[PDB]
Amino acid sequence: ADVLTELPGVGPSTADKLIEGGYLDFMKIATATIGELTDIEGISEKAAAKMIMAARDLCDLGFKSGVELLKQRQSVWRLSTGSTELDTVLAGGIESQSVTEFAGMFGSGKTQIMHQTCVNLQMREKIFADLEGVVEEELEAPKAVYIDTEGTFRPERVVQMAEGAGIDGQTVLDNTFVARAYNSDMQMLFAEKIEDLIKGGNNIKLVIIDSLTSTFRNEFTGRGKLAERQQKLGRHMATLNKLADLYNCIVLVTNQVAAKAEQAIGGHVVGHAATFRFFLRKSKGDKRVAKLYDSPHLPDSEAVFRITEKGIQD
Ligand SMILES: Nc1ncnc2c1ncn2[C@@H]1O[C@H](COP(=O)(O)OP(=O)(O)NP(=O)(O)O)[C@@H](O)[C@H]1O
Ligand SMILES: [Mg+2]
Ligand SMILES: [Mg+2]
């Protein structure tokens, strides 16, 4: 919480050395390691160790029980997908503090959903938050980050969906950051640089990686390169899960499929890292089916939706 000097043992000099290293929030320090803190100019091990324990304490990161357990869950806000049936399967909508994955064959609607969420983020009526755990100013001027790894981001579609929702398309564009990544290195670096946007005053509440695996699959083709691929993708996923928890934001990813009748690629690393996993498939015409096949507390379920000129509906 911005004022690091409120941390016991931390004076103005230290606070400066810290912000430089990219530490501007209590939680970031509380979850750091003595190593990464000592990597900063004149921050000793004793100090590093001390502020870490102080930050944890300040954020009250201890044992919780009873009602406190429900309170923690109230800090999770949800975003509407534009589909009633889909939102119901999600038990409200897409959850912040988690990674939700949409995998499916070509044209199943993975990118459409990504675009719709950018629009919905700009409509508070589309955001469902418990006032008892999410302060309204935490939702003010929400911004989205779209890491486009295939080059399929379409400003036109965002504007069109915005119109379809009854709001200004230019407003959505002004509040949506897009980063075109040509390989996994850029993809991962962009994800890591999202912190700079937040530090810059942007309230990043939606992070989209479309596609999550296309780059990796094309860069590590040999089966004798499976381990290589998994390790890098694993670090990427960890970065994603941490920013989702740390900044109470939604992380949305898309995934392609492969035969054996099909399954999402990315291996176990993506399998374990994603909290919610969906399989998108096409039906008659503009109809689509979204099958939730993995989550920590929701049963497997299907939702029928459509992709139209307005965007996602039903
Ligand atoms: N403006 C529009 N109006 C109505 N339908 C549209 C419009 N734009 C796209 N679609 C539909 O969206 C489908 C493609 O959605 P898309 O989100 O790109 O699929 P995808 O799963 O991400 N495929 P891919 O990127 O290859 O993996 C089309 O084939 C169109 O039927
Ligand atoms: Mg999480
Ligand atoms: Mg796509």
UniProtKB/Swiss-Prot annotation:
Keyword DNA damage: yes
GO molecular function: ATP binding; ATP hydrolysis activity; ATP-dependent DNA damage sensor activity; damaged DNA binding
Coiled-coil region list: none
Family annotation (InterPro entries): AAA+_ATPase, DNA_recomb/repair_Rad51_C, DNA_recomb/repair_RadA, DNA_recomb/repair_RecA-like, DNA_repair_Rad51/TF_NusA_a-hlx, Hlx-hairpin-Hlx_DNA-bd_motif, P-loop_NTPase, RecA_ATP-bd
Keywords on record: ATP-binding, DNA damage, DNA recombination, DNA-binding, Nucleotide-binding
Domain of life the protein comes from: Archaea
One GO term (biological process): DNA recombination
Record: residues binding ATP: 104-111
Protein task: Involved in DNA repair and in homologous recombination. Binds and assemble on single-stranded DNA to form a nucleoprotein filament. Hydrolyzes ATP in a ssDNA-dependent manner and promotes DNA strand exchange between homologous DNA molecules.
Family: Belongs to the eukaryotic RecA-like protein family.
Name of the protein in its database record: DNA repair and recombination protein RadA
Native source species: Methanococcus maripaludis (Methanococcus deltae)
